[PDB]
Amino acid sequence: IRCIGVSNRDFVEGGTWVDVVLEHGGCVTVMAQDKPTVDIELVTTTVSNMAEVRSYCYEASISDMASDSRCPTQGEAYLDKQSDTQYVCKRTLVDRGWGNGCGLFGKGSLVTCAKFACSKKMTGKSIQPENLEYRIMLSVHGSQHSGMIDTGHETDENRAKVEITPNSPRAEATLGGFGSLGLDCEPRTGDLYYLTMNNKHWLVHKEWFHDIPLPWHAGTPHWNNKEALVEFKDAHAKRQTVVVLGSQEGAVHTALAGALEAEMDGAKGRLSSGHLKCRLKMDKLRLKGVSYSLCTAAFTFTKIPAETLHGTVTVEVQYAGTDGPCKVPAQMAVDMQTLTPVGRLITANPVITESTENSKMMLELDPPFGDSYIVIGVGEKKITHHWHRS
Amino acid sequence: IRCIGVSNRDFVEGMSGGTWVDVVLEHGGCVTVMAQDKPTVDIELVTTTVSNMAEVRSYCYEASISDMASDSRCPTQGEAYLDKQSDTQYVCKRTLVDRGWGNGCGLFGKGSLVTCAKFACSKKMTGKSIQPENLEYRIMLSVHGSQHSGMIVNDTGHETDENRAKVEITPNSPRAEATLGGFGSLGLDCEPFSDLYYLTMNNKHWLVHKEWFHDIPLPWHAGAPHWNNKEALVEFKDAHAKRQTVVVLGSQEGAVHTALAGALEAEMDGAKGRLSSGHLKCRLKMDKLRLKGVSYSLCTAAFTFTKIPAETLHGTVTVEVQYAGTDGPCKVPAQMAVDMQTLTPVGRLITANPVITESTENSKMMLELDPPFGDSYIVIGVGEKKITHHWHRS
Ligand SMILES: *[C@@H]1O[C@H](CO[C@@H]2O[C@@H](C)[C@@H](O)[C@@H](O)[C@@H]2O)[C@@H](O[C@@H]2O[C@H](CO)[C@@H](O[C@@H]3O[C@H](CO)[C@@H](O)[C@H](O[C@H]4O[C@H](CO)[C@@H](O)[C@H](O)[C@@H]4O)[C@@H]3O)[C@H](O)[C@H]2NC(C)=O)[C@H](O)[C@H]1NC(C)=O
Ligand code: NA
């Protein structure tokens, strides 16, 4: 019943195997003759062990600015901080003469150094294909009431959590009295890096990531290409001004436009977009209560029939009888004399499971276009509801 | 002497005596002007400033969001409403979300969702207007003759020093007269934004085009606030049935800075803007310019080289000498010679009438010469105690 309400909802009809395409945000209702209806959804795709590859500085700070200068023919300018790896330096040639303290007129050497510090960095992580995990949720059309309409699936036969990984593509899901469903999925269909910048994530190309013009370190940190976040403007003969370029967060963000965005789930990456092809084994799937007799007593609508986005109807009824467990007489009819079924049920084998009076139950129907009637129960006491589709 | 050391240095000579000389003053450039029976003067356009810049528009480049809230309705329960959706400090997004019996709705279909966030600017950039009349050109004047080495780069005390002068030229006042104490005076008649704006962002300044400035895709407000186009820095992302995520785009300082590459960069000088690049055509009046110290006698005592004679980029030779005598103020005997017996002058001086201005012993003085090609001798002083320096020009 988990697909009921989902916009991107598909319907597959089957018989030993049914092929199903599971997409993120999507849900598949699977039907097969003499088998219960099952809702299947790819709920999350996660990657578990992302190793840091390279981080890039997008906001830097500079301090301890100093200079050294030489006169023409006096050789290269020298600062002791030009061997400190935390410093960024620029070596230039400046016009010198009697006006600024040289015996000769010509180009002298100038060196300017600044202590570079990163304020904010973005980290790129590796994705190993084996480290992908697909979580699939299963939910049978088991005649649940609205008070049964995600947690506690291990103790509820109608629900199951399946874990699919590239190494373990096959799984078997027990559904209590419904028997079991087998799943054999192909990940494959679902050059990249996992990028994080200020609690924002993306899946970026390898070539693009490596050619980012910002200071970087591999895997206290040593920044390679600090020159990218600084600017050395010539100011005087014995001094050169050095200034930080300012935060590149916005520029990087707009460069990432169109690129695939991702999310986090603790220390694990979550793929918002994914596709998974599964082959479902139907041999062990079984309808509960084929031995049940048709319910003989009166039904009453608890909830007003409501149309889903796909034009199907959800119906909730209450049952006055004590002859439970029994089959729910349910159909749609165009004429109330003949009562030949029109449309079809989505819920295979709708049942009142309890032997108690005034018990609730929910079912889903696929009405024909135009006017028809929802019909619950048998004989004189049968309840009717006018319906219109499109 | 202020042109000595300048790479972009020009030399202009005046006619037989002469009354006027035309000069082109560029930023970073310097002009040495010479004329017969007149002292040599160095003239430089030192700064161009703009005085009364009115703010036109400010753009937000770093924003912050707070007070994030949502409202969601079931299908047929109408439109989602927050009271902040009409508050001008807020940025909102109205969307449709999947609803049903699992979401508390009696019906299955799309329900209205509204998300709103209070927008605040952290950092903004301001664009200012430049009125053509509000331009000011500062010209520095330096006379050759008295000054030693230490005065090539100084600009402290020109108000009390006859050798130096500050001239202020504006579009409304293009003519100025500069008094040079005993050197008389020099007259200046110079010839000095319709599509340009002055931009300021985090103590960094530039001159930007009008069309470029107005088409900047960032939140803005006119004058010196209500932010128009807050959406430029706010991203809405759908997250759930009753909630949607809203996030700030992050600082655009870097992106704006790289977009400004190639564009003309500017500077500030207090509350006034400073144009790093400029050009000024001046006509100089030479009639009132006079050679101070023609009455001076030739220095009789010994000279000694303080600085070794050095060739400038243009092949001139700067000489700095110290003077042992107390008979100051006096004329420095200075020339170049090819032979030390005959001593007939060769080349010429750049510094017209070099002098020892002080009556004190061991005073310094600097002069500039224009040597002939090949070998020559720099001769300073008279008689037996005269000092010589061999020189070669190629
Ligand atoms: C920029 O220019 C200023 C001033 O301009 C110039 O001042 C003269 C030096 C001269 O060249 C002028 O043509 C011109 O206006 C410079 O400031 C001067 O700096 C000097 C040296 O630092 C000072 O000289 C001192 O003057 C005192 C006068 O009473 C005297 O006590 C000092 O002692 C000297 O004499 C005794 C022996 O008796 C002994 O201690 C030493 O022999 C010592 O030199 C000394 O002569 C001037 O006072 C300063 N003048 C002003 C107005 O500030 C400035 O240094 C220069 N800056 C740069 C960057 O070039
Ligand atoms: Na003066």
Q: Is A10 on the interface with B (CB under 8 A)?
A: no
DSSP result, B256-282:
HHHHTTTSEEEEEETTEEE-S--EEEE
Surface-to-core class of residue A319, CB atoms within 10 Å of its CB (0-12 exposed, 13-18 middle, 19+ buried): buried
Report residue B115 as tokens: 């998300």
What is the distance in A from the centroid of ligand 2 to the CA of B182?
10
Task: State the CB neighbour count (10 A cutoff) for residue B40.
Answer: 23
- Are B381 and B303 spatial neighbours (Cβ–Cβ below 8 Å)? yes
Q: Is B155 on the interface with A (CB under 8 A)?
A: no
Q: Is B156 in the pocket of ligand 1 (CB under 6 A)?
A: yes
3-state secondary structure of B387: strand
User: Candidates B151, B292, B364: which one to mutate for ligand 1, based on the most atoms within 8 Å of Cβ?
Assistant: B151
What is the distance in A from the centroid of ligand 1 to the CA of B150?
10
Q: Which of B167, B140, B117, B118 is nearest to B2 (CA)?
A: B140
Q: How far apart are CA A282 and CA A163, in angstroms?
A: 19
Q: How far apart are CA A57 and CA A215, in angstroms?
A: 5
Experimental resolution (Å): 2.2
Q: How far apart are CA B203 and CA B223, in angstroms?
A: 19
Answer whether A5 sits within 8 Å of B313, measured CB to CB: no
Phi, psi of A247 (to 5 degrees): -55, 130
Instruction: Give the DSSP letter of residue B27.
Output: T
Residue with the smallest CA separation from ligand 1 atom 15 is B161
**Which residues are CB-neighbours of A359 under 8 A, at least 6 positions away?**
A145, A318, A319, A324, A352, A353
- Are B168 and B137 spatial neighbours (Cβ–Cβ below 8 Å)? yes
- Are B26 and B10 spatial neighbours (Cβ–Cβ below 8 Å)? no
* Chain B nearest CA to A8, separation (Å): 10
Q: How far apart are CA B99 and CA A307, in angstroms?
A: 12
Residue with the smallest CA separation from ligand 1 atom 55 is B150
Q: Is B104 on the interface with A (CB under 8 A)?
A: no
* Number of continuous H segments (helices) and E segments (strands) in chain A: 2, 30
> What Cα–Cα distance (Å) separates residue A210 from each residue in A46, A123, A125, A190, A217?
24, 12, 12, 24, 12
- Are A274 and A45 spatial neighbours (Cβ–Cβ below 8 Å)? yes
Q: Is A97 on the interface with B (CB under 8 A)?
A: yes
Residue with the smallest CA separation from ligand 1 atom 21 is B150
Report residue A274 as tokens: 């994914």
Task: State the CB neighbour count (10 A cutoff) for residue A201.
Answer: 18
Q: How far apart are CA A152 and CA A144, in angstroms?
A: 15
Nearest Cβ partner of A98 from B7, B253, B307?
A: B307
Q: Which amino acid is at A236?
A: H
Q: Which amino acid is at B58?
A: S
Q: Which of A344, A310, A234 is nearest to A6 (CA)?
A: A310
Surface-to-core class of residue B341, CB atoms within 10 Å of its CB (0-12 exposed, 13-18 middle, 19+ buried): exposed
Residue with the smallest CA separation from ligand 1 atom 5 is B157
Nearest Cβ partner of B4 from A98, A149, A307?
A: A98
The residue whose two tokens read 């695939």 is A260
Q: How far apart are CA B361 and CA B43, in angstroms?
A: 31
Q: Is B251 on the interface with A (CB under 8 A)?
A: yes
- Are B152 and A95 spatial neighbours (Cβ–Cβ below 8 Å)? no
What is the distance in A from the centroid of ligand 1 to the CA of B60?
51
Ligand number nearest CA of B365 is 1
3-state secondary structure of B258: helix
Q: Is B157 in the pocket of ligand 1 (CB under 6 A)?
A: yes
Residue B78 φ/ψ region, left for φ over 0, alpha for ψ in the -120 to 50 degree band, beta for the rest: left
Q: Is B295 in the pocket of ligand 1 (CB under 6 A)?
A: no
Task: State the CB neighbour count (10 A cutoff) for residue B264.
Answer: 13
Answer whether A105 sits within 8 Å of B311, measured CB to CB: yes
Q: How far apart are CA A386 and CA A196, in angstroms?
A: 55
Nearest Cβ partner of A105 from B98, B253, B310?
A: B310
Q: How far apart are CA B5 and CA A380, in angstroms?
A: 115
The residue whose two tokens read 């079931």 is B74
What is the distance in A from the centroid of ligand 2 to the CA of A204?
66
Task: State the CB neighbour count (10 A cutoff) for residue B116.
Answer: 25
Phi, psi of A222 (to 5 degrees): -90, 115
Q: Is B372 in the pocket of ligand 1 (CB under 6 A)?
A: no
Size of the A and B interface in Cβ pairs below 8 Å: 108
- Are B70 and B242 spatial neighbours (Cβ–Cβ below 8 Å)? yes
Atom of ligand 1 at shortest range from CA of B164: 15
- Are B338 and B377 spatial neighbours (Cβ–Cβ below 8 Å)? yes
What is the distance in A from the centroid of ligand 2 to the CA of B181?
6
**Which residues are CB-neighbours of A190 under 8 A, at least 6 positions away?**
A45, A132, A134, A271, A274, A275, A276
Nearest Cβ partner of B251 from A149, A249, A307?
A: A249
**Which residues are CB-neighbours of A91 under 8 A, at least 6 positions away?**
A76, A77, A109, A110, A111
**Which residues are CB-neighbours of B271 under 8 A, at least 6 positions away?**
none
Residue B390 φ/ψ region, left for φ over 0, alpha for ψ in the -120 to 50 degree band, beta for the rest: beta
Q: How far apart are CA A205 and CA A189, in angstroms?
A: 18
| Residues of B with Cβ-Cβ distance to A303 under 8 angstroms | 101, 106
Experimental method: X-ray
Domains and CATH numbers, chain B: 1-51+131-194+264-291 (2.60.98.10), 52-63+122-130+195-227+249-263 (3.30.67.10), 64-121+228-248 (3.30.387.10), 292-394 (2.60.40.350)
Answer whether B108 sits within 8 Å of A246, measured CB to CB: no
Q: How far apart are CA A329 and CA A127, in angstroms?
A: 53
- Are A116 and A106 spatial neighbours (Cβ–Cβ below 8 Å)? no
What is the distance in A from the centroid of ligand 1 to the CA of B241?
80
- Alpha carbons within 13 angstroms on the beta-carbon side of residue A266 total 5
3-state secondary structure of B231: helix
Atom of ligand 1 at shortest range from CA of B153: 60
| Residues of B with Cβ-Cβ distance to A5 under 8 angstroms | 98-103, 108
What is the distance in A from the centroid of ligand 1 to the CA of B51?
35
Nearest Cβ partner of A7 from B98, B250, B310?
A: B98
- Are A29 and A10 spatial neighbours (Cβ–Cβ below 8 Å)? yes
Instruction: Give the DSSP letter of residue A249.
Output: H
Phi, psi of B125 (to 5 degrees): -110, 135
